[PDB]
Amino acid sequence: PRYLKGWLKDVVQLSLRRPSFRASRQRPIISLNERILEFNKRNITAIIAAYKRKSPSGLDVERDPIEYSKFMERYAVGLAIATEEKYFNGSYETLRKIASSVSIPILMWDFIVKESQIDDAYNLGADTVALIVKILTERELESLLEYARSYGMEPAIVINDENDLDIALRIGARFIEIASRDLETLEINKENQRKLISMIPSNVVKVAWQGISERNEIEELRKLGVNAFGIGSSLMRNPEKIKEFILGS
Ligand SMILES: O=[N+]([O-])c1ccc2[nH]nnc2c1
């Protein structure tokens, strides 16, 4: 991983030590970026709903993850399931159970720093993973992206500034998450997010993530070329808000 400080250094150290999940996958791979483009062609707003029991940007939410994921199967283009243990209060078992219960694409959200965690995502049933530019060197990013694609996954490459975007293009990202929250300070900068979105080539599948809370914002971002919208805490609180994000109120 890159030289890191503070909580990022801590979470990367923890992830390096994460024991692997050693069972065979029992689920097809279903492409999250292809389904996003299908929604686009169908003029259906594409929301990637996240399940996260906690995050550094929100309070813990104790809801049944299965009931949540079955509800979202009706509406969302894909689910993102936060599996990191210390800061997201996640578990591989929650991912495994959700993947066993739903037939929409699933992204495993965690801090992926070694190949065995991509083996884990595949074996647990996730269709794809995020890879985070801020924590991985270019060589690790390239290696892990190639590794994930050898399983038939197309990872979301997470960026939050111009440096990250330059590295995403350099490693041949096809599917970019433009995160409006800086991982290190937790600050949201939407002006920067919109600038980055305007700099991405039109053939890359773009997900705007973090701080999206209104149908109007989604409509604005769609007009700038964004393909899909990742939304976590507002849906962890009120899953039915997803109906207004897709259909208006
Ligand atoms: O909780 N999540 O599943 C999840 C998904 C994507 C994200 N991007 N930035 N933070 C994120 C958290």
What CATH number has the domain bearing residue 115?
Answer: 3.20.20.70
Specify the residue for token string 């069972």.
Answer: 23
Query: How far apart are the C-alpha atoms of 134 and 137, rounded to whole Å?
Result: 8
Q: Is the dihedral of CA 123, 64, 17, 207 positive or negative?
A: positive
Domain hosting residue 163, numbered range: 1-249
Here the tokens at position 40 are 């686009």
80 Cβ inside 6 Å of ligand 1: yes
Listed as own residue / partner, the contacts of 10-16 with beta carbons closer than 8 Å and 24 or more positions apart are 10/86, 11/84, 11/86, 11/87, 11/111, 12/111, 12/113, 12/135, 14/84, 14/85, 14/86, 14/111, 15/84, 15/110, 15/111, 15/112, 15/113, 15/114, 15/117, 16/113, 16/114
Beta partners for 80?
50, 107
Query: Among 203, 189, 197, which residue's Cα sits nearest to residue 226?
Result: 197
Classify 78 as helix, strand or coil.
strand
Q: Give the resolution value in Å.
A: 1.6
- Cα 108 to ligand 1 centroid, rounded to whole Å: 9
Phi, psi of 109 (to 5 degrees): -100, 115
- Non-local (6+) Cβ contacts of 159 within 8 A are 133, 165, 167, 168, 176, 177, 178, 179, 196
Question: Among the residues of the chain, which ranges form H helices?
Answer: 6-16, 32-41, 65-72, 92-101, 115-124, 138-150, 162-170, 190-198, 215-223, 233-237, 241-247
Classify 229 as helix, strand or coil.
strand
* Tally of domains in the chain: 1
54 Cβ inside 6 Å of ligand 1: no
- Non-local (6+) Cβ contacts of 39 within 8 A are 45, 46, 77, 228
Cα 3 to chain center, whole Å?
23
Phi, psi of 18 (to 5 degrees): -65, 125
109 Cβ inside 6 Å of ligand 1: yes
- Cα 28 to ligand 1 centroid, rounded to whole Å: 23
Q: At what angle do helices 162-170 and 138-150 cross, to 10 degrees?
A: 50
